[PDB]
């Protein structure tokens, strides 16, 4: 045993190393989204820099899920990051389409890692999750959500003007 | 009853006090290890300050908790602050361990006291240790941890060195 | 084929997709190295922030190789992100060691990367590898070596006192 | 021989030449793309300061030219500044992709005088051409590429409306 460690299940060290995963795998796919968007033929580049900023986001994520594994004294164990499911992302639509799922996905890891906490009475984990993920998750959410149906009433995926459109006063 | 308390049940009332008396109790322990680094035979002046802050820190989370206690429509009632365990501390490898005995056994008791309002549902208590205890708690066991690490890796306690090179390098 | 794409070879192509992704591997190397070295039973703070850089540097070179694809005009073609070596590093000299190990490695496949530039006659990469590449490397390996030539002579692996004494004074 | 030549070859100093009169054929080129626009039957302004703008440049890409030629101790000679290919260039979509086109060409150029600096074994005519030229034109190759794909999705050549969304937001 770590000198440090009180109150941690080691049922909770191990989803920590998952949930820091998992993050890592979402920021490799937000930086596929990204190097899709600025290739030459799709040419969006503020969407192309949304994504590009959403990867820097979850990377941070992720350095934050070290920091606090060591804080409590479990050890950190890293995995392979697996590449992301495509190498192409359609079009606007089906990349924040993506992007959402993805998100849902996060959000459930982390719903999951909070419930695993409220079962093993770990109340320093607890409020971890709540205050530097949980509010954040739904805040990106419902933007991403907010984005998919503007995009839906520009007429995409057929309607090459709206995703200019978007491109030029939906992004800052 | 008093007209303010709302949803507040006896226990954690009483545990409240319970708590407020503990904070005190580590102040003064703290106070002591002050007063230790400080002698002329002793002297190393950064670990005595480091011990004067913790003393000024913990004095102030007891005093938050009598605001607490009357927030909450419950009373103050005070009990006697008990000396601490030793009026010699040995060295700073021997304190710094007698610190994270302290502080694990004053964390266990938030533990405790946040254990208590789950069961009594009392999310505002839940709320108040979660936002400005628990964390700041887990922090100063690293802090103390990595410290212990440092000291041993020093060759205390027999090494007199390593005690004046920690002292003018690990602590501000 | 893309109507950016002029003096791009298939071969380079795929050789910046492969050097894109050893760059992220030493970067998910170097966290590794930080979680170490963040960790309450090694706990050599400034140690583990020169990994956090590292960390943060290298990622940025994959970044701009990304960046690179697309303005050629080639492809980006992400693959998973292998797991470090080691889940653990030992000692401040025996990660040096391991960092220094690294770098030559990446030096060398961006060496590989410009004997390829120069048989393909494409002298935009084999610019953009001496400018933005190529010297940072060097620089970047002499500094390791100089931390490992300090650390011996500090009497690492076994002498405790001198990795402390490396940890305050070599790194800020 | 000029008292100052060194290492330069006969060859070399010809094809500093052809390459002058090239960014010249270019700068040119461009002011007739910039005359177009300003039309008041054609009208697009901004699109019309793209042109002028790419062709002040393009005029201080050849001055640069002529000022290497000098500190090597070769010797300026100038041609004829061929009059552009066409009077008039039919809408934003048909200029940018002469555009192109012209950009292409010149890189081309600029890579047959470097290929001629390795075979001549000429190191300051090697770096002159990749520090100065030959970042830029990928570059600019690069955003006359996105410019054609957001063209190409605002329905052009038919969609006016598309034209003007162009002219106004994608360019400055
Ligand atoms: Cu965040
Ligand atoms: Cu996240
Ligand atoms: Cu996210
Ligand atoms: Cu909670
Ligand atoms: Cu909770
Ligand atoms: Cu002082
Ligand atoms: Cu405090
Ligand atoms: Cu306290
Ligand atoms: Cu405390
Ligand atoms: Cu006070
Ligand atoms: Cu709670
Ligand atoms: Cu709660
Ligand atoms: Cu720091
Ligand atoms: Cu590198
Ligand atoms: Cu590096
Ligand atoms: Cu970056
Ligand atoms: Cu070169
Ligand atoms: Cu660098
Ligand atoms: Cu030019
Ligand atoms: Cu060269
Ligand atoms: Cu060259
Ligand atoms: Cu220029
Ligand atoms: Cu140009």
């Known amino acids: 045993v770590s000198q440090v460690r009180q109150n941690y299940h080691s049922d909770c ?31 969006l580049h503020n969407v192309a820099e949304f994504f590009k900023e959403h990867s820097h986001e979850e990377r941070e994520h992720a350095e934050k899920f070290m920091k606090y594994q060591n804080k409590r004294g479990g050890r950190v164990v890293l995995q392979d ?30 719903l999951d890692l909070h419930k695993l906490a409220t079962d093993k009475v770990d109340p320093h984990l607890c409020d971890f999750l709540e205050s530097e993920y949980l509010e954040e998750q739904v ?16 007429g995409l995926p057929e309607n090459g003007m709206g ?8 992004v800052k």
């Open 139 to 154: 805040k990106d959410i419902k933007r991403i959500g907010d984005f998919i149906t503007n995009l839906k009433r520009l």
């Open 163 to 170: 995703e200019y459109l978007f491109d030029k006063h939906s």
């Open 81 to 110: 990051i697996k590449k992301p499911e495509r190498d192409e992302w359609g079009n606007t639509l089906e990349a924040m389409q993506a992007a959402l799922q993805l998100e849902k996905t996060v959000n459930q890891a982390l």
């Open 13 to 43: 060290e191990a989803a920590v190393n998952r949930m820091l995963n998992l993050e890592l795998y979402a920021s490799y796919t937000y930086s596929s989204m990204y190097a899709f968007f600025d290739r030459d033929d799709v040419a």
